[PDB]
Amino acid sequence: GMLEVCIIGFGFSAIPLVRELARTQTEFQIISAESGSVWDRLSESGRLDFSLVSSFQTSFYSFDLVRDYEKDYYPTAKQFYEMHERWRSVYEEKIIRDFVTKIENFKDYSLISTRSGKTYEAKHVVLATGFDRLMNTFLSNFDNHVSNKTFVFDTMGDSANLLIAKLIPNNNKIILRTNGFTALDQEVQVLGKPFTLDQLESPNFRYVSSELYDRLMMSPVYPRTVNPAVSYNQFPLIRRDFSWVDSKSSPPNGLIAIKYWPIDQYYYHFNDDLENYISKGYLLNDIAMWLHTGKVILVPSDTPINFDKKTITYAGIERSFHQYVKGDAEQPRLPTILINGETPFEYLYRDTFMGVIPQRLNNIYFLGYTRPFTGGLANITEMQSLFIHKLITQPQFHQKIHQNLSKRITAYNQHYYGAAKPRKHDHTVPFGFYTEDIARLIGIHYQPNECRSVRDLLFYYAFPNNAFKYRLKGEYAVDGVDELIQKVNDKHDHYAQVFVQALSIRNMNSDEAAEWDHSARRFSFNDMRHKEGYRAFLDTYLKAYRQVENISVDDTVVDEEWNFMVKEACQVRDKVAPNIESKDEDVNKGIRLILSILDSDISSLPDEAQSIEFIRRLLQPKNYELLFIR
C-alpha cells in the first residue's frame, strides 16, 4: 500500500505529468511549498507588468492550445501566471503544502522528509522545483524611481534585457561589459506576415545533413557575413568566443540567445493603442535599437573597474555607477538526495539522460531543468512529462531505457557536446531537437518514409516540432489537435516559406548561405537598416511609457562623458554603416512551385527540375541515426 508517485514542486512544469497520471488513475501525491514561486512574488508586489519572450504555441500546453488558440501572440506575464493559478486550482486537493528538505533513495522507493517533520514513502519521485535565480530580486523588488544613473552589467540575458527595457525610459545609461551575447528578433516579417523565430527553424532538416542544417541556421549567430547592416559587424564587441563548440549538431546544446522585440515589429503590433499595450506588459526591449541610439554601450570584458570607488575606466574615463549587476549562477532547487540513503547525490546536467533521469538513483525523475534555446518551456516540459509518465506507468519502457542508461548518456553527450567540458549552460537545447528526441524515444515520432504527398513533407520537415505536433495520434493523443494543426497550417501557408529556405541553400557553401541570408531588404535578425526610421516612434514610445508609469524626466541634461564613451563605443559603426549598399526573389518562386505541387505524390515525382529530385530524396534522409535511441 505504498504511494506510487510523489511529485515535489507544483508551478508550471508539473502540470502535464499530473494530467497524465490522473488519466491513467496512477496513485500520486504532490508536495509543494506554501510560499509558491517568483510568479507569486511578482503578483504580490504588482510587478506582472511584462510579457513572455516566447510564442503562445510554444508556451502554453497542447490541452490549453486546442481550446484557446485563434492566432499567434506573445502572452503577458499576467496571462502566464493566471494559467498557472487555473491549473493549481484544478489539482489543489492533491497538493500537500510543505517543503521537502531531504530525499533518501533506496533500491525501489524513497523516503521524503519535510520541514513540518512529516515523512512520505513513494516508489517514484518527480522533482519539478524549478531554479533559484539571483536576478529575480531585481525584477520583484528593485525600484523605478532611479534616473540618470549608470548601470554596469557583466552579463546579458533575458532578465538583464527586461531590466534594461524598464531602466532606459528613465534616461539610465547602460554599460554592458561582456564576452559577447547572441540576441535574436523574437518576430520576423515573411512576405508581410509575422512569424515568431521558433516557427522558422524546420529542425528535422538536420536529418538530411548536419552541414545543410548548419548553413540554414547559424549565419545570424556566427560572424559569417561581411554585410555591414548586421549588428555583429556594426558592434563587434557583441561577438562571442564559440571555440568551446565540439559538436556537428547546430545550433549546439549550450548556446543561449536573448529574444527581443525589434522596433519595426513592435510598431506593427502596438502603434494603434500604445499606452494600453505598454500597461499590459508589451515593453520595447530592442537591444539593437539601444546600441544604434547609444542608450546602451558595449565595452571590452577586461575593461578595468574599481568596486570600492564604484568606477569603470573606459575612453580614458574613470566612470562612476549606481549599480553593478553580476548575472545569474542559475541552478536547480534540489533538496539533498542521499544515494542508498547514505551518499549525497551530485547534480550535473550531462550526467542525466535527456535532463530527466539521473544515474545512481532509482525511480527519481527531473522535470523542468532543460531550457529551450528558443520558444517557451512548455514544449520541453510537455514532452518530458510524457517520457516520465511512460517510465512510471510502463515497466517494459522503464526497463528498455534503464538497461543501457550509462551507454545512452555517453552516446547523447558524444552527439551533442563531443569533448567539450561541462558548461553552466549545458542544460540549453534546441527545442525542435529535444522534442523530436523524446518523441522518438517514446515512439510517438513521425517516419519520413511514411510521407505520401508534398503536403506531408511540409508537415514532417517544416511544421515546428512543438509538443502538440506529437499529440495528434497514438499513445498521448489530445482531443482537438487535428483542428489546431489545421488552423496553424491555414494561417502560415503550411510553412512552405520555411521549406523553400532549405531548398534554396542546398547547393551553397556556408559563406554563400550567409550572404544569401542577408540579401533581403530586411533580413530576419539584427538588421540595423531598420532603426533610424523608427526614432520618431521611439520618442512616442518613451512618452507613452512615462505616462503609463507616472514618470517625469526632461531630456535636456547632457552627459558629455557618456557621449565620449558612446562615440568611442560606436567607432567601428561610424566606419562600417556608410558601406551599406536574392532571398526575397528566390523565396517567392520557391513558394509558387511548392503550393502548386502540394497534393502531388512524392515517390512518383519525375526525374526547379533538381529541386524536385531533392524533394523526392526527403523520403530517405541519410542523417537519421541517433545512437542514444538505437
Ligand SMILES: Cc1cc2nc3c(=O)[nH]c(=O)nc-3n(C[C@H](O)[C@H](O)[C@H](O)COP(=O)(O)OP(=O)(O)OC[C@H]3O[C@@H](n4cnc5c(N)ncnc54)[C@H](O)[C@@H]3O)c2cc1C
Ligand atoms: C522573470 C522570468 C521570466 C520568464 N519568462 C519566460 C517566458 O517568456 N517563456 C517561458 O516559456 N518561460 C519563461 N520563464 C521560465 C519558466 O517558465 C518559469 O521559470 C517557470 O516558473 C518554471 O516552472 P517550474 O514549475 O519549473 O518552477 P516554479 O514555477 O518555480 O515552480 C516550482 C515550485 O516548487 C516549489 N518548491 C521548490 N522547492 C521545493 C521543495 N523542496 N519542496 C516543496 N516545494 C518546493 C516552489 O515553491 C515553486 O512553487 C521565465 C522565468 C522567469 C523567472
Ligand SMILES: NC(=O)c1ccc[n+]([C@@H]2O[C@H](COP(=O)([O-])OP(=O)(O)OC[C@H]3O[C@@H](n4cnc5c(N)ncnc54)[C@H](OP(=O)(O)O)[C@@H]3O)[C@@H](O)[C@H]2O)c1
Ligand atoms: N523558455 C524559457 O525557459 C525562458 C526563455 C527565455 C527567458 N527565460 C527567463 O529569462 C531568463 C534568461 O536567463 P538569465 O537572464 O536569468 O541569465 P542567463 O541567460 O542564464 O545567463 C546569461 C549569461 O550566460 C553567458 N552566455 C554564454 N553564452 C551566451 C550567449 N551566446 N548569449 C548570451 N549570453 C551568454 C554570459 O555570461 P558569461 O559570458 O560571463 O558566461 C551571460 O551573461 C531566465 O532565467 C528565465 O527566467 C526563460
